[PDB]
Amino acid sequence: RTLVLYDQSTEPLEEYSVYLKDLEQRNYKLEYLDINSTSTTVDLYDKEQRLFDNIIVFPTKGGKNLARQIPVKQLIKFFENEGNILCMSSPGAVPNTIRLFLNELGIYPSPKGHVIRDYFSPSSEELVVSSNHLLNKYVYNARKSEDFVFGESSAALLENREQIVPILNAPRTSFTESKGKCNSWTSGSQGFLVVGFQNLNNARLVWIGSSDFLKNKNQDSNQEFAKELLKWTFNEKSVIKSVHA
Amino acid sequence: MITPLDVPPLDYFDEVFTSENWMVRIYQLKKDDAQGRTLRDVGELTRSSTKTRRSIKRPELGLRV
Amino acid sequence: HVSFPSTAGKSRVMIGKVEPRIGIDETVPTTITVEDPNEVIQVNFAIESTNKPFQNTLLIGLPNKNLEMAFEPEIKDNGKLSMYKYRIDLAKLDAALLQEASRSPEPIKATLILASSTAKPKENLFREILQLNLNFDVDHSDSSL
Numbered sequence: 016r017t018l019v020l021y022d023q024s025t026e027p028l029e030e031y032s033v034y035l036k037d038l039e040q041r042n043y044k045l046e047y048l049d050i051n052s053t054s055t056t057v058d059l060y061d062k063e064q065r066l067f068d069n070i071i072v073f074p075t076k077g078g079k080n081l082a083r084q085i086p087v088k089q090l091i092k093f094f095e096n097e098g099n100i101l102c103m104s105s106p107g108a109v110p111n112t113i114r115l116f117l118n119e120l121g122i123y124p125s126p127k128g129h130v131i132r133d134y135f136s137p138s139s140e141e142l143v144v145s146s147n148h149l150l151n152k153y154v155y156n157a158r159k160s161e162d163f164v165f166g167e168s169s170a171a172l173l174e175n176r177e178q179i180v181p182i183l184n185a186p187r188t189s190f191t192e193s194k195g196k197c198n199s200w201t202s203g204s205q206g207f208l209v210v211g212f213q214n215l216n217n218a219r220l221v222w223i224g225s226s227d228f229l230k231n232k233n234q235d236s237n238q239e240f241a242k243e244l245l246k247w248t249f250n251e252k253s254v255i256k257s258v259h260a
Numbered sequence: 261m262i263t264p265l266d267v268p269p270l271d272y273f274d275e276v277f278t279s280e281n282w283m284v285r286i287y288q289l290k291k292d293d294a295q296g297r298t299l300r301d302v303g304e305l306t307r308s309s310t311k312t313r314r315s316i317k318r319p320e321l322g323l324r325v
Numbered sequence: 326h327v328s329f330p331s332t333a334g335k336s337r338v339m340i341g342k343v344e345p346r347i348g349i350d351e352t353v354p355t356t357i358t359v360e361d362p363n364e365v366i367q368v369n370f371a372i373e374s375t376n377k378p379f380q381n382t383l384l385i386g387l388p389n390k391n392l393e394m395a396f397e398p399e400i401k402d403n404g405k406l407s408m409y410k411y412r413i414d415l416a417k418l419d420a421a422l423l424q425e426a427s428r429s430p431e432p433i434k435a436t437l438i439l440a441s442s443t444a445k446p447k448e449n450l451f452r453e454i455l456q457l458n459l460n461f462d463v464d465h466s467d468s469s470l
């Protein structure tokens with residue numbers, strides 16, 4: 016079922032154990048692959064039959080190890096066949112394979128070195144985002160006020176398609192600060208942090224623009240949102256059936 | 261005289277039948293992309309040979325509703 | 326070098342009634358608001374006080390609908406005071422913003438942000454300058470917005 020891909024160079028697998036365990040706790044046959052010191056390549060398809068139902072791409076730096084296991088064309092062929100994806104692109108860990116796959120789906124994430132900065136921050140240390148910026152009840156509806164710890168993060172520019180499901184918004188004051196002199200990638204509340212996609216085939220993708228959102232350290236702040244997010248991504252939360260028209 | 265470069269590719273229709281002497285030709289409308297992108301873009305993707313992208317440049321796309 | 330703000334709002338038709346109609350969150354607010362009657366550039370002046378303007382941005386949209394645009398300024402440093410000018414073209418505005426404003430009665434509003442990382446908390450500026458009430462009935466019936 017689920018396939019987990021991770022790089023032990025950028026972020027170890029243990030830091031994201033809680034949520035994976037919860038998956039195990041609900042009968043998720045996780046198969047774990049590491050891309051740092053592996054040569055064999057996973058074959059998503061065996062004679063035109065996909066071997067997995069979902070896939071998780073934990074934070075990885077761009078390299079030729081990712082471009083070999085999940086090339087863009089294989090990702091699009093998996094996605095057209097109803098596979099569900101869960102990407103994660105922190106600043107300083109944005110692969111070109113994810114970035115290009117998501118530029119094909121309409122979502123334009125900021126590239127490396129573009130870090131969102133908010134000066135009207137609750138806590139100056141890291142980018143905490145309140146729960147008022149949630150933009151879809153079906154994905155997740157907060158009953159009470161929550162402050163999500165997002166760490167260093169990036170933003171996404173969204174096209175005007177029917178398939179894109181925005182989920183969270185950057186703070187209205189917040190802006191991206193590129194190390195270079197290029198203008199801000201996103202300026203205000205037009206940069207999205209969490210984003211989702213649903214095909215016409217009902218396959219679902221979700222992009223989280225931080226690497227610290229799903230870490231064990233921030234478990235208490237971000238457990239309800241994270242668990243409902245993963246349930247939505249895997250077609251387990253808000254699926255609808257029409258009967259007997 | 262018709263040369264191979266006088267005929268641009270068809271990105272929205274498939275050939276399904278062509279009679280024996282090429283007198284009747286039947287094409288079929290292909291269903292739109294699941295990802296909701298124009299079929300010309302799918303084509304120009306499946307044709308353009310693999311090469312490094314020109315650069316990473318902020319897209320001019322407008323305002324998200 | 327303290328700053329003097331001018332919002333040169335270039336127009337296309339019956340612009341509106343820029344005005345700070347109701348009392349708002351007054352965190353280091355604008356010292357005063359003003360206007361001029363010139364047709365080509367109905368510039369609006371306001372000499373507000375920033376603390377450090379590393380972030381200097383004017384958002385001309387509807388905050389509730391999340392439709393906002395970010396307008397950078399133009400800084401001229403005389404050496405005693407710095408002059409900021411934001412030039413807004415009513416014609417070159419997002420189609421969705423125009424349509425949303427026309428379809429439902431509400432005023433397009435302009436919020437100013439001046440801030441810095443090194444600034445003390447509560448010394449940054451995030452305040453609504455004006456609320457234009459557009460009147461030109463010129464909107465397209467059908468568009469992809």
Ligand SMILES: *[C@@H]1O[C@H](CO)[C@@H](O)[C@H](O)[C@H]1NC(C)=O
Pocket residue numbers: 023024051052
């Ligand atoms: C895989 O392991 C480490 C991560 O701990 C990585 O830095 C290295 O490049 C790889 N190879 C070896 C031998 O560690």
